């Protein structure tokens, strides 16, 4: 829903009409294609909330 946004040191995703930063995550984003296609795409580490729960 939001725009990817940066304060210079970090990247966040934020709703259009009121500033609120959130950590970019599998649950506020979706995947298509691959990195070769898009104009102006940038590199960052998208978080996965399941990953610390791999005990089972």
């Amino acid at each position: 829903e939001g725009v990817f946004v940066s304060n210079g040191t970090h990247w966040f995703v934020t709703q259009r009409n009121f500033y609120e930063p959130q950590i970019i995550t599998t649950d506020n984003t979706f995947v298509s294609g691959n990195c070769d296609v898009v104009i102006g795409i940038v590199n960052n580490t998208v978080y996965d909330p399941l990953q610390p729960e791999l005990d089972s």
Binding site: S32, G33, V37, V38
Partner: protein, 49 residues
């Protein structure tokens, strides 16, 4: 509020129920279609008073 023009068009596409990646994965093609369409309107006015 300033916005990069390609990202504006992604929201215009999202507003008609086409997922926003469809712009970015085709941006070159969509630009060439838009520029060509503008050319035809100039020809219509250049001929059809």
């Amino acid at each position: 509020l300033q916005i990069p023009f390609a990202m504006q068009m992604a929201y215009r596409f999202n507003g008609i129920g086409v997922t926003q990646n469809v712009l970015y994965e085709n941006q070159k093609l969509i630009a060439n279609q838009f520029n060509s369409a503008i050319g035809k309107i100039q020809d219509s006015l250049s001929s059809t008073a």
